[PDB]
Amino acid sequence: QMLPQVPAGLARGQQSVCEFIATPVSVDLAYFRRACNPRGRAAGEVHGEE
């Protein structure tokens, strides 16, 4: 039970996976031109504590 069908033949390297995140239409474009975080809050850990 439950298994993605194995494809017949690969043309190039192994296939990636893409996701989708809802975001308001009015977000500032330039937020994506430079390195950014898909979250929106760029927290991570290295710059900032708990």
């Binding site: 190039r12 390297g13 893409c18 996701e19 989708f20 809802a22 975001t23 239409v25 009015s26 977000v27 474009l29 994506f32 950014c36 898909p38």
Partner: protein
């Protein structure tokens, strides 16, 4: 071989060892990056402008298809063939009980 002020060895271990054996070479690393791209954002009224007077002029006698809010993206594949992404593919996310 001498580099800087030091005197260091220099080796390749593909022929003396690892040659004609089904084990891969362990210096061929695997870098990792993560790409992101906005899909259908819409810029405000102030920064919608032609960079030149002679624009991507459409066929005379038709409304321009450019000012319309975009709903797709485009980028390049590994080899270089163009390959686009459209709202249609997002069906696998926004059409589910999880929503």
């Amino acid at each position: 071989v001498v580099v800087g002020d030091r005197l260091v060895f220099l080796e390749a271990l593909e022929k003396r060892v690892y040659q004609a054996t089904q084990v891969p070479y362990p210096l061929v690393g695997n870098l990792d990056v993560t790409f992101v791209m906005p899909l259908g954002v819409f810029k405000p009224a102030a920064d919608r402008y032609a960079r030149h007077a002679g624009s991507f002029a459409p066929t005379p006698g038709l409304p321009d298809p450019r000012t319309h809010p975009p709903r797709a993206v485009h980028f390049f594949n590994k080899d270089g063939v163009p390959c686009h992404v459209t709202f249609e593919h997002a069906m696998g996310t926004l059409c589910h009980p999880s929503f």
